[model samples]
Target chain A: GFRKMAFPSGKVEGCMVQVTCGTTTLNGLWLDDTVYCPRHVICTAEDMLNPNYEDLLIRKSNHSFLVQAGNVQLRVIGHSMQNCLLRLKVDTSNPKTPKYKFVRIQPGQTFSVLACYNGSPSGVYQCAMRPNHTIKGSFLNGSCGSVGFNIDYDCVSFCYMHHMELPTGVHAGTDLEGKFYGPFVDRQTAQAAGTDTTITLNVLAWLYAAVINGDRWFLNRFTTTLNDFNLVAMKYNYEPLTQDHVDILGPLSAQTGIAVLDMCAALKELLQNGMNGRTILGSTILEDEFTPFDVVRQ
Target chain B: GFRKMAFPSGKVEGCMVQVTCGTTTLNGLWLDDTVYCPRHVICTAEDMLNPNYEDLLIRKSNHSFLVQAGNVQLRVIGHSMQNCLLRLKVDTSNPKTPKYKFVRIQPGQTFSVLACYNGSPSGVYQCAMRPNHTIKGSFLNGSCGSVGFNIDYDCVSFCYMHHMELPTGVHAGTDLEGKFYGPFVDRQTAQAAGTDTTITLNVLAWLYAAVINGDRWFLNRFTTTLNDFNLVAMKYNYEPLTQDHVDILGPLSAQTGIAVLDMCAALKELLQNGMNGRTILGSTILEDEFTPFDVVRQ
Candidate 1:
C-alpha cells in the first residue's frame, strides 16, 4: 500500500498575527511557533477589548498542492511570510536510495514530499531548501541546504481543527482515521469571520456577563449556541454554570485581564497620536462594538 | 567555675592496637593512637588477647600547669613528637584580648599551651607548633605555625585502664579510682624496666595462656590476678572463658593468629641468618619460662 502526505498552505498555524506599524498594518504569520517580535509598536488594553477587531485567518495560499509524481508525491506547501523553490528526483531501478535534490524556498513557504520504495516497502521522500541569495551556489553543487523535510503522514490529525466524526457504516474509503481526516476548518472561519482566540475570550466574557445579569437575548447573540458552549466547556473539564472549577475560571480571568487592562497605558497615548484608527488586533471596531453590556443588539 | 584540663604522656588511644617489631621485643608508646609504622615490627594475637596490654600509662609532664597570665591561663602542657615556643603577655585594663606574642620551638616536637580569658569564660587555650630549621622565621616575626591544640581531659577515664578500689578510700579524689587504685604502675618502669603497649600485649598473651591452660602462676601473672582478668574481661565486653561471644573472640583470634605465627616465622628466620639466641619476645627465653604444661611449677 502506498503512503500519502499533505503540505500546509498560508502559515503552518491555523491563525496569524496583525502587527500595526505607523499608519500601516502588516498581516503576517510567524515562521515558527516560537517566533518573537520586538515591542516596537504601541497598543492598548482597550484596543484588545473590541470584539469586532480582526486578525488575519490562516487561509490556504495559492501554491498548495498534493500530487503523486514517479514513485513519490511532491507537495508545494503554502507561503507564510516567505517562499521556497524545490526539486525532487528518484531512481526506479534501485528504489532503495534516491538521487538527492535541492530547492530554494522563500521565507514563509513550506514544502513536503514523499517517496515510495518496495522490497523495502512503503513511501520515502526527501526535500531540501537551498541557501539564501547572499550565498551563490548551483543546485548541482549540493553544498549546503536543510537536510530534508520530515513528512507528516496526515496533516489534519495534528492540525488544531475540530474533527467532525464520519458517521459509522459510511464509507471511509481510502481515508483512514489517523491517515486522513477533516476538511479542517480554520478557527476564524469556523467562528464569525474576524474573531480569534482573543475574541473567543470576549465571547466568553459576554456569556459570563449575560448569565450574571440575567440577560437572555445577549446570550444568544453569537452563532455559538448555549448547548455548544456548554459542551465545549465540559470537554475542557470546566463546568461553567457552577463556576466551581478554578482550572478554567482562573485562566479565563487571566486572559480576560490581559485583554481588558494589562497592556501598558503608554501604548494608549501612542494609539491616540500616531495610529489613531488602529488597534492591538490590527482591526478597529465601531464605537458601539466597544461597549460591554450593550454590545449585543437586535 | 574555671575549666580544668589534663595532659597525656602515654598512648593517645581512644582504642589501643597491638604491634610486634623484631626479636628485640620491647614495648613502647606511639605518639598517636592511629600510628602506623611500616617496617621495624611484628606483634602477636595472644598479646592482644590479654585485656591487660595496658598501653603506655598517662602521666603528667613537667610543663603541665595552669597559671593566669593577663586574660588567659598560660598552661605549658606536654610534648609528644615536637616542641613549640610561646610567649604570654598581660593587658590588665582591657583583659578581653591580649597582645599576641611569639616564640621559637623546634620541629618534630609538639607543645601544648592554654590561653584563658574571663570577659566570657575560662576554657580558652591555644597551642601552636614552632617553625622548622628549613623555614627561618621567629615568633617575633609573627610568622606561620599551627594555631592551637585541642585537649581531651580525664585521660584514664578515656583510657582502658582498670580502676581498682582501694578499700581504704582515703584520698577520694575524682580520679582516685584508676590512678590511685591500679597499684598504679607505669608501663615503662614496669616489667623488665623498658617496655610499653607491646610488652603490655606480651603480658596479656601470657595471662591468656595461663587462663586457658590452667597454669596457676601464669594465672597470677602481673599485678592483675586471674580474678582481676575475669572482671576486666567482663568490663571490656569479652566472655573469654567459654569463647561464646564472637564480638571479643573474633577480633582477638585474628590479632592473636597474626602475632603467634607471624612473629615465629620472622624471628626464626632472623635467628637462622645472623641474629641468634633471640626468641619471639626479642630476648632469649629462660629455660623455665619456655616450659608449657609444667610452666607454672614454683
Candidate 2:
C-alpha cells in the first residue's frame, strides 16, 4: 500500500557481479512470537505481499539500489506463519546457479546478517517467500506419484532441496543423503527400497541437535571467510573435506537447531500446555507470545 | 529500618517447613541491558525462601501473598548488590548462626523485602522486595563454605535459615556437599588415554547443547516425588523419606543430579584449579527462573 514504481524489462547492465546461491552461508529465522516480536522487525515492500516479490538483486535505500551504501534485511511478520517456511533463494543474474559463498552471524543473542548471495555475471539474488511447509507433497521422491516423470527429475529436485548439504560425511555414514540410520534393517529392504532405505525418521534427540549446530557453525565460519573471497578460494573449498569436519559438523547442525527449538518447546509446554502430566505434542511449537497463562499451556 | 523488634534471645522458633524453593513458576524475561535489569516475578513467599512464611501460609491473598495487602508492605529498599549474593534469610533473631531459605531473584536487579514478622507473623507478611540483582559469589559452587566456622567467612549470608530436610536419599550434587569428579584430561592426553581409562576431550562445538538437553531431562525427572511433599507435615519435622520412599527415589535423586552436573562440567571444559570455568560446579541445586545460553562447541 506504500508508494510503488515500475521498471520496463531491459538489461540493467554494468550492475553485474559474481555471487553464490545455496548452502547454509547465511542464517535461518525459525520465526515464532516468543523469540521475535513483529515490533522488532522492519518489514520490506516485498514482505507485505504474500512475500512473492521479484528476485531482489540490489541493496536499497529509500527503496533505491544501494548495495554498497546500505544492506538488505528480511524479517518475518504477520500471522500466517504456521503454514509457511521462509524460503530463501539466491542467484546471480548470471546463467549458472552459483555455488554459494558463506556468511556468518553471531552466536546466541548476537544477531548478524550475512549476504546470502554473492555476485556473478547474473549477480546473486535472494527472495524470502513462504514456501509450502509440507515438502513431502511436492517432494520429487516417489512418495508422491507423478505420471510420465523421468526419475532423474525427481533426483535433481528432491535431492538438492530435501537432502540439503549435511555436515560432511553424514551421507556416507547413513549411505544416503537426507536418510537416517533407522530403517535399513535387512538386505532386501536395503536393496529394493533404494533411497527410501537411505532416509529414516530421526529419534535420537542429539542427532537433531547436531543438524542445527552444524548450520550455526556454517553461518559463523562462512561469514568470517566472506571478508576475503580470493584468499579463501585459493586455500579452502577446492580441497577435499576432512572426515573430521564432516562427522563433527553433522551433529553440530542438528544439535544447534534442536537447542533453539528445545527452548521454544519447553516454554510452549510450560505456558500453554501446562506440564499437568504429559509431554506436549510437537504442534504446540506454533503458539504466539503474550499469551494468557492458562491458554498458553493449552 | 522499616520496623525492628528485638527478641530477647534474638531467636524465634516455630516449626520449619521443608518448602522446596526455587523458581516459583514465572515466565522468563529477556534482559536487554549489557548486564541485568529489573523484572517482576510472581511467586508466594512460602514458595520461595522455602520456609513457611506464616503469612503466605495463611493465603491472605491470591497465590501471590505479597500483593494481597493493599497500601502496605515490608520494604528492603536500595540494597547495593555488586559481586555478592544477598540472601533473604529467616529472621530467627540469632547472633552466631543465620538460618535462611532459598528465594529466586535475578542478576543486577534489586531484591526487595517479601514480608515482615507481625505478632504470629501477620500483617503484610510476604511483602515483595525489589533488589537490583540476584547475587552469586564468584566461587567454586556459588554457595557459602561451611557452618559455625569464622563469623564473616561465608560468601553471602542470611539469618535464621532452616536446613534442607535431606531425604536421606537426597544427595546434593555440588562441592557444597563435598562431591567431586576427577582430573581433567588435556585434549591430546585424553585422547591418548583411550576410550576406557581416561576422559575424552571432544572439542565438539555441539557438545554443550547435547549436555544441556540432557540436564533438563534429568532435572525434570529426578526424584519426581521428593519435591512434592505437603507443607503441614513438613512443618512438623516430618522427614518425608521413609525406607520405602528412599528405595523408590534413591536412584532418581543420585543419578539425575550427578548426571546433569557431570555433563555441565564436560561441556564447560572446566579444567583443574587455574583453568577452571565459572560454571555451576556443585551439588546444591539453587532455584532460579532465568535460563542462560552458551555455545556448545569449540
Candidate 3:
C-alpha cells in the first residue's frame, strides 16, 4: 500500500469539481472553496464508523483523515477494499446459512475450468464487477452445464438475467447491481452437500478470461463514467435519478455489467473441472520467460 | 519426453486389437500374429517418412522405429506432435503468404485476454482443435470485438460456424475438422497490417480455459471414442467412412470442436487484450501456494 501523493493539500484544475453521493448536495452545490474532493467529505470522530465513508470517492488520504499543512485533520472516509467479502452458501446446504471467506489471490493465478461430473448446482445470486469479483454457479435440469459468472464485487443481491431467449442463451446471469436469474444448481453428492469446505467444481473454461475483460472495462469505464456523470447530476444539486440522468448515465453501467452476464451465459457448456487439485488443464506453466524459437534461431 | 511404460513388449488383452488407418487394412485383416499395437504398425526404412506415420496412433517408443525384442526394427510410425504447426498469415498483409511458427508452450504458461484495440481483423481459416490449438479471430462489421480462437492444431481450412441465428452468435468460429463460417476480419491500423511479425490481438477471455477444457475432453473421450467406433467399423474389414461410423462417432467430434466454437461465439463481447503485453486481466499468480484464511486460522 503506497501513499497517493498527487495532491495532499488542495483541489485540482483538471479533476472534477462536483460529484454525487447517494444524491447528497451542499447549498445548491456539492463543492466548496476549502474542499479537495468532489465534495468536502468532512467527518467527525466516530468510534465504530462514520457517515462519510458510505460510497465516497476519496481524494486526499492520511490514516482515515485528510491531513493538511501538518495540522488540519479530518476523519477517515474509506478503507481499501475493507468492504469486499466472499460470503456464500451452497444452495442445497441444510441451514442455507452463508459463510465467510476473504479472497486473497495474486495476479496471473488461475481459477478456471477443470471438472465435469454427474451432478447439478443451481442458484440465484447478484454481483458488481469489481476487483476479483465474479458471480458463478451452474445448471442441472434439462441442460447440464457450468456458468462463467463474470466479474463482480462486494455486494449481496439476487443475481438476475435480463436476456433469455428460449434456447439461444448458453449460460445465465444476473444484473451487475445483484438481481439474478432462476434456480441454478450445483452437482451435489452425498459427500458434497456441505458449504463448510471449498468444493472444487467445474467453471466455464473462459471464466478467468471473462474476468479479465470485465475488470478492464471496470477500471476504464465503471468509475470514470460514474464520476463524469456524477458531475452532471451535481449541476442540479445532486438531483434524483429521474429521467434526466437515467437516460444519459444508466446505460453505461448496464453495458459494463450486462456484458459480463451475457458472456457468462455464452460459456454455459464450456466447463472443465481440473482433476486431483490441478485447477487448470492445459499447457504446463513453467517458471521461465519465453523466447520464441524463431528469435533464438536468429 | 519420457517413455511410456504401460507395455513395451507385446499387445495386451486389455488394450485394443484392430484400429483403422485412413481406411487401410491388411490382407482381409488389420492385425495379425506379429502385431503389437491395436494392429502391427509395421514400417520400413525411409529417409523421409513412412505410410504408417499418417493418422497412426503410436504405442511404443524409440527413435524413428519400434525396436521389438532387440533385433526387429520397424521404422518410426508417428512423432509426438511432429505434424502440429502454427503457420499463419495476417489477413490484410501484402504477400498473403502464411509463414511458419513451431509452437512451444509449457504447462500453465498463460496466453489469454490482454488485448482490445480500435481495428478490424477478419479472415476465413480452417482448423483442428488440438495441442495449443484455438481458432480466434474477430468481427468488425456492425460489432467490434476480439476472437477467443478456441483450441486447435495444425490444419489449414477456412474457419466456419454451424450455428448463426442472425442476431445471435457472439464470437465466430470454423468447424473442428476445418471448415469455417464467414468473412471475419481483424483490427487494422497503418502499422498493424503485416504478417511478418506476431501482431498481438484480443482473444476470448476464456480462450486459455477453453483450451484446458478442450484438451481434457480430447484425452478422455476423443481417441477413446474414435477407437471404440473404429473397432465397430472393423467388424466390416476396415470399411470406408460411409453412413457407418459417421452416425456413431461423427457427432462426438463435432461436439468436441463445436463446443469450443460455440463458446467462442458466446464470448464475442467478452474480449480483453491485456496491457503492457501482460496478456492476462485478473488475479496475479503469486509465487506461493495459497493457504485459505479459515484453514490458516485453524
Chain A TM-scores of all predicted models: 0.18, 0.16, 0.16
Q: Per-residue lDDT tens digits of candidate 3, residues B118-145?
A: 1111111211221122223223332212
Which one is best on TM-score? 3
lDDT of 1 by residue, A1-298 (tens): 0001122211122112233323322221122221111111112232333312123213223223222222343333322221111111112122222222223332112223211111010111111111110111011111111111222322212111111112221111001111212232211122111111112223343333333333332111123333444455444333333233223334433534332221112222222343333322222221111112212210
TM-score of each: 0.13, 0.17, 0.17
* Superposed model 1: Cα runs more than 4 Å off: A1-298, B1-66, B69-179, B183-249, B255-276, B281-298
User: Residue-wise lDDT of candidate 2 within B1-298, one digit each (tens)?
Assistant: 0011111111111111111113431111011111111111222343233432333234322222121111222222221111111121221222322343223322211111111111111101111111211111111111111111001212222221111112121111111111111122101111111112111111111222223334332222222233343232244232233334334323333433443224333323222221221223111111121111112100
lDDT, candidate 2, at B45 = 42
lDDT of each: 0.22, 0.19, 0.22
lDDT string for model 1 (B1-298, tens) is: 0001112211121111222232312111122211211111122334332323223112323233222322343333332321111111111222222222222332212222211111111111111111111111111111011121222332222211111112221111011112211123322222221111111122233333433434322111123333444454444333223222222223333533433323223322322352232232222221111111111211
The CAPRI classification for model 1 reads as: incorrect
Give the per-residue lDDT digits (tens) of candidate 2, residues A1-298. 0000111001111122221122212112111121111110122433433332122212222222111101333222222211111222221122322222212111110100111122111111111101111111111111111100001111211111111111211111011121222232211112222221100011112223323223121112112222233233224211122233234334433434433233323322233333332222221111111111111111
For candidate 3, give the DockQ.
0.01
Q: In terms of DockQ, which candidate is stronger, 1 or 2?
A: 2
Give the per-residue Cα lDDT of candidate 1 at A84.
16
